[PDB]
Amino acid sequence: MSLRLERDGAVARLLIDRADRRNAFSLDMWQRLPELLAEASGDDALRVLVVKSANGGAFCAGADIAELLANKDDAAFHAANQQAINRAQYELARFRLPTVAMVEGDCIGGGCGIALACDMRIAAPAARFGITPAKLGLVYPLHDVKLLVDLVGPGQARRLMFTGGLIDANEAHRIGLVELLGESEDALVGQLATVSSFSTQAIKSFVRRVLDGQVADDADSLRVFASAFEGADFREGTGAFLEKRPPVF
Amino acid sequence: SMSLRLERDGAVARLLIDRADRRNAFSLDMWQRLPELLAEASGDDALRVLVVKSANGGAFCAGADIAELLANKDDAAFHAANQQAINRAQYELARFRLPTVAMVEGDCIGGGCGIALACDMRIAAPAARFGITPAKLGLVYPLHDVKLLVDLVGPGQARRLMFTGGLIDANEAHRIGLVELLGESEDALVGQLATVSSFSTQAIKSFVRRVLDGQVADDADSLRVFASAFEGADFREGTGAFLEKRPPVF
Amino acid sequence: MSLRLERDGAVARLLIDRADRRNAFSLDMWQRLPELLAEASGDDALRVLVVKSANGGAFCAGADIAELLANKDDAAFHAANQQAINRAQYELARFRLPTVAMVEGDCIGGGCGIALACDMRIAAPAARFGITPAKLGLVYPLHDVKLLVDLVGPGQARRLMFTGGLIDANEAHRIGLVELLGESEDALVGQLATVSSFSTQAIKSFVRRVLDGQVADDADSLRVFASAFEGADFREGTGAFLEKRPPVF
């Protein structure tokens, strides 16, 4: 399959495997993505989801161009495609566990949307980023405009979206589009896999609350904080600390 | 008075600050003039990008006309009118319908920094310097402009600059996100901005403004705007040009 | 005297003085902090508050570990500690005057919280930063999640909070966690102490309104702006300029 899930204990990988079209997404792939997220989310052992190319190279060149051109006069297709992309983007960005995009090549348009929906991004030296709807007279979904502005601010967001020009790995790192430069996700994934999954999931939800406009602590966020002390992970943390050993979460 | 003037050149318009003998400092009449020139530029259907720059290079804008400030220091009526005129100019520049670029080649201070902040993006040449200096005279900065600054550089850097009134150079402005690009000239960027879809740039600019105004999710309107693109002439030109392996002419 | 306040005219110093526990905070230090803020705030001569270690080295290694372990099953302690930390953080972040954190060593967990609640941070070359609740199965308070996201954005915030990994002074500077690199706060403090305190206090409040979600000027903010022209600092600013002398605010 051109989009598949691999589950390897604490780590799952969402793999994009369509090298002959530079990992371009078709409508069926967009529709499939939420199903794979649901499969991954149902695994209690999972600690981190990695999104990456199955074969290195391009991360995702964006829209399937043959599909775009074949359906350029098809209103039903455009509506279905809009909904599928928006669903996929919405769900990926709110996946319960930490998510990492490993970008080793071109990450364009809808591909950039996928990367933006992950919690953090690692860029290898060949990585390139761009958002190109202005080159076809199209718009970017507001959900994804917000993901972009959240990371790089409105100046860089407009620079990228108005021009549709590509930027390289170092510039993406400089402007905050990617958090890390590196050849592999292994080191980061190792760190993410060993911490408390109670903590990561709760903190992830707090960050989302802040991004959705929450300004101060309220009764619920105070309760979530306090609930940690009743949890098994806190008991493992304190027990491990007393025994001078690493906690095993 | 031609201390602020508009040049319209097809797809590109230039809002030129032309008061070299006062280092491009703004007087009240220039603040009044600014939205009038924006209205003229906006009425042009052929326009694709507005560039804000010095007519003569050097200083972009050294801030408030100091002679005017001192002469009117006890004049409450002047202060009221000046506050409202500046706030109108800033508000309108920040919401200009098309892409705007500030080309900064020298000192960009106070209200001058306000103008640069109200553009969509900024390019800084090597001699560009930036500062917000109201704390040196016991003044405040408008909340609208505080927000423009915090949007770009965050509250730590915003407070560093506004509390001290100290200047930063082009490289530090670039590092903290006050300017998006370093360069001697706007020509390359303007060329890119002039040749993309103006349907796209205007719609996207409005989306970014909705996000900055606190919009969190897509709604009926934003979903409609997105869908409307496929009914547009620019999309038809885009796909037609792609099939013919030629550049689109939007 | 683990936490103490020095008042030196225009400059006050909140000094963390517990070197034998790497400046770790106990409950009583958290409770003492707002009392010292109230004392500082009552001084009309004050222009800037500096938060720093009394003895260089670590800024604050985080929670008093012996205290944490001794109270691991004490619900009353957890409630009191949560309340004290949140109050201290809330009040420090809203102190009426400019605040500067001078970080010369490790700044971890609750220590990073204190640093984040200052207006700006200077890091010396040995400074290191980390937020580590995920290593103990705990959450970070939403107020402090917001302080972090405000500075570094959601990507870097999640990188730091999910891994609990430390970053060095240069990376903290690169991602916007600290505003300045330097060995000493003296130059910055000199600059802050000589500007208008009418201006700094008013501007600080405007920045806070923006962080709390204010998007446009309103009657109140227009009024605050206009009120500057009736103030003694504006008269001193213009009078000094006319007399070609430095202003004395």
Which CATH number do you get for residue C98? Answer: 3.90.226.10
What total of structural domains would you count in chain C?
Answer: 2
Q: Under a CB-based contact definition with an 8 Å cutoff, are residues B17 and B60 in contact?
A: yes
Are B83 and B173 found together in one domain? Answer: yes
Q: Phi and psi (nearest 5°) for A42? A: -70, -10
| Residues in B 110-139 with any Cβ partner in A closer than 8 A | 120-122
- Residue C77, helix vs strand vs coil: helix
Residues of B in contact with A215 (CB under 8 A): none
Q: Under a CB-based contact definition with an 8 Å cutoff, are residues B175 and B83 in contact?
A: no
Instruction: Tell me which residue of C135, C183, C195, C130 sits closest to C160, measured CA to CA.
Output: C130
Q: Under a CB-based contact definition with an 8 Å cutoff, are residues A116 and A85 in contact?
A: no
Closest-CA distance, B145 to chain A, in angstroms, reads: 14
How many angstroms separate the Cα of B124 from the Cα of each of B57, B60, B184, C185?
A: 12, 10, 7, 29
- The Cα–Cα gap between B120 and C60 comes to 40
Are C175 and C225 found together in one domain? Answer: no
Q: Which chains touch A (3 or more CB pairs under 8 A)?
A: B, C
- The Cα–Cα gap between B222 and B205 comes to 12
- The Cα–Cα gap between B25 and A35 comes to 60
Q: Quote the crossing angle between the two packed helices B198-212 and B220-228, to the nearest 10°.
A: 170
Are B183 and B204 found together in one domain? Answer: no
C242 and B70 within 8 Å at the Cβ level: the answer is: yes
- The Cα–Cα gap between C111 and C131 comes to 9
B211 and A146 within 8 Å at the Cβ level: the answer is: yes
∠ CA(C150), CA(A209), CA(C90), 5° rounding? 55
Task: Give me the sheet containing C120-123, strands edge to edge.
Answer: C3-8, C11-16, C48-53, C99-103, C120-123, C180-181
Residues in chain A: 249
C203 and B160 within 8 Å at the Cβ level: the answer is: no
| C176–B contact, CB cutoff 8 A | yes
| B147–A contact, CB cutoff 8 A | no
- The Cα–Cα gap between C225 and B86 comes to 12
Q: Which domain holds residue B159?
A: 1-196
Are A14 and A43 found together in one domain? Answer: yes
Instruction: Tell me which residue of B117, B106, B178 sits closest to B142, measured CA to CA.
Output: B117
Element holding C3 (H helix, E strand): strand C3-8
Q: Under a CB-based contact definition with an 8 Å cutoff, are residues C27 and C66 in contact?
A: no
Element holding C34 (H helix, E strand): helix C27-41
Question: What are the beta bridge partners of residue C53?
Answer: C16
Residues of B in contact with C151 (CB under 8 A): 154-156
Q: Under a CB-based contact definition with an 8 Å cutoff, are residues A89 and A60 in contact?
A: no
Indicate the residue of B192, B204, B207 with minimum beta-carbon distance to A165.
B192
Are C89 and C132 found together in one domain? Answer: yes
Residue B49 CB contacts under 8 Å (≥ 6 apart), including other chains: B11, B12, B13, B98, B99, B100, B101, B190, B193, B194
Are B5 and B76 found together in one domain? Answer: yes
A137 and B238 within 8 Å at the Cβ level: the answer is: yes
C180 and B160 within 8 Å at the Cβ level: the answer is: yes
Q: Under a CB-based contact definition with an 8 Å cutoff, are residues A34 and A87 in contact?
A: yes
Q: Under a CB-based contact definition with an 8 Å cutoff, are residues B103 and B49 in contact?
A: no
Are B168 and B230 found together in one domain? Answer: no
**Which residue of chain B is at minimal alpha-carbon distance from C48?**
B163
- The Cα–Cα gap between B65 and B27 comes to 5
Q: Which residues of C56-205 form beta strands (DSSP E)?
A: 99-103, 106-108, 120-123, 128-130, 167-168, 180-181
Q: Which of C195, C214, C235 is the last residue of a domain?
A: C195
Q: Within 13 Å and on the Cβ side, how many CA atoms surround C141? A: 26
Instruction: Tell me which residue of C132, C130, C131, C124 sits closest to C103, measured CA to CA.
Output: C124
**Taking the CB of residue A243, how many other CB atoms lie within 10 A of it?**
9
- The Cα–Cα gap between A86 and A82 comes to 6
B235 and A138 within 8 Å at the Cβ level: the answer is: yes
Relative to beta strand C128-130, strand B107-109 is unpaired
Closest-CA distance, B38 to chain C, in angstroms, reads: 21
Domain at A211, CATH number: 1.10.12.10
Instruction: Tell me which residue of B102, B225, B88 sits closest to B152, measured CA to CA.
Output: B102
How many angstroms separate the Cα of B130 from the Cα of each of B91, B171, C60, C121, C182?
A: 20, 11, 34, 21, 21
Are B202 and B128 found together in one domain? Answer: no
Q: Under a CB-based contact definition with an 8 Å cutoff, are residues C180 and B160 in contact?
A: yes
Relative to beta strand C167-168, strand C128-130 is antiparallel
Enter the tokens of residue C95. Answer: 């102190």
| Residues in A 202-221 with any Cβ partner in C closer than 8 A | 202-204, 206-207, 209-211, 213-218, 221
- The Cα–Cα gap between C11 and C187 comes to 12
Q: Quote the crossing angle between the two packed helices C197-211 and B143-164, to the nearest 10°.
A: 130
- The Cα–Cα gap between A173 and A167 comes to 10
Enter the tokens of residue A44. Answer: 């209690």
C145 and A210 within 8 Å at the Cβ level: the answer is: yes
Enter the tokens of residue A69. Answer: 């051109």
Question: What are the beta bridge partners of residue B64?
Answer: B26
Are A39 and A160 found together in one domain? Answer: yes
Closest-CA distance, A171 to chain C, in angstroms, reads: 13
Indicate the residue of C135, C159, C213 with minimum beta-carbon distance to A179.
C159
Compute CA A88 distance to the chain's CA centroid, rounded to the nearest angstrom: 10
Enter the tokens of residue C147. Answer: 């302080």
- The Cα–Cα gap between A23 and A30 comes to 12
**Taking the CB of residue B240, how many other CB atoms lie within 10 A of it?**
13
Choose the mutation target among B86, B133, B139 for the interface with C, i.e. most C CBs under 10 Å. Answer: B139
The amino acid that residue B186 corresponds to is E
In angstroms, what is the resolution? 1.8
Interchain CB contacts (distance < 8 Å): B and C: 136
Residue A221 CB contacts under 8 Å (≥ 6 apart), including other chains: A206, A209, A214, C141, C142
Torsion of CA B23, B28, B31, B33, to 10 degrees: -100
Torsion of CA B103, B105, B106, B112, to 10 degrees: -10
Q: Which of A195, A217, A235 is the last residue of a domain?
A: A195
Residue A219 CB contacts under 8 Å (≥ 6 apart), including other chains: none
B160 and C215 within 8 Å at the Cβ level: the answer is: no
Indicate the residue of A133, A138, A155 with minimum beta-carbon distance to B152.
A155
Are C190 and C233 found together in one domain? Answer: no
Q: Under a CB-based contact definition with an 8 Å cutoff, are residues C175 and A177 in contact?
A: no
- The Cα–Cα gap between C211 and C191 comes to 25
| B44–A contact, CB cutoff 8 A | no
Q: Find the largest Cα–Cα distance for chain B.
A: 67
Are B123 and B204 found together in one domain? Answer: no
Are A141 and A72 found together in one domain? Answer: yes
- The Cα–Cα gap between A185 and A104 comes to 11
Residues of B in contact with A165 (CB under 8 A): 192
C162 and A200 within 8 Å at the Cβ level: the answer is: yes
What secondary structure letter does DSSP report for B231?
Answer: G
Place of tokens 């003229």: B40
Residues of C in contact with B154 (CB under 8 A): 150-151, 176
- Contacts for B235-239: CB closer than 8 Å, 24+ residues apart: B235/A72, B235/A136, B235/A137, B235/A138, B236/A137, B237/A137, B238/A135, B238/A136, B238/A137, B238/A138, B238/B197, B239/A68, B239/A69, B239/A72, B239/A136
Closest-CA distance, B194 to chain C, in angstroms, reads: 30
What secondary structure letter does DSSP report for B136?
Answer: G
**Dihedral sign, CA of B29, B33, B34, B35?**
positive
Residue A25 CB contacts under 8 Å (≥ 6 apart), including other chains: A16, A60, A62, A63, A64, A110, A111
- Residue A17, helix vs strand vs coil: coil
- The Cα–Cα gap between B158 and B171 comes to 17
Q: Within 13 Å and on the Cβ side, how many CA atoms surround C214? A: 20
**Dihedral sign, CA of B130, B136, B137, B139?**
positive
A241 and C75 within 8 Å at the Cβ level: the answer is: no
How many angstroms separate the Cα of B132 from the Cα of each of B117, B181, C146?
A: 11, 20, 26
Instruction: Tell me which residue of A123, A89, A92 sits closest to A106, measured CA to CA.
Output: A123
B139 and C192 within 8 Å at the Cβ level: the answer is: no
Q: Output the DSSP codes for A107-148.
A: EETHHHHHHHHSSEEEE-TT-EEE--GGGTT----HHHHHHH
Q: Phi and psi (nearest 5°) for B31? A: -60, -40
Residues of A in contact with C138 (CB under 8 A): 196, 199, 225, 228-229, 234, 237
| Residues in A 94-113 with any Cβ partner in B closer than 8 A | none
The amino acid that residue B248 corresponds to is P
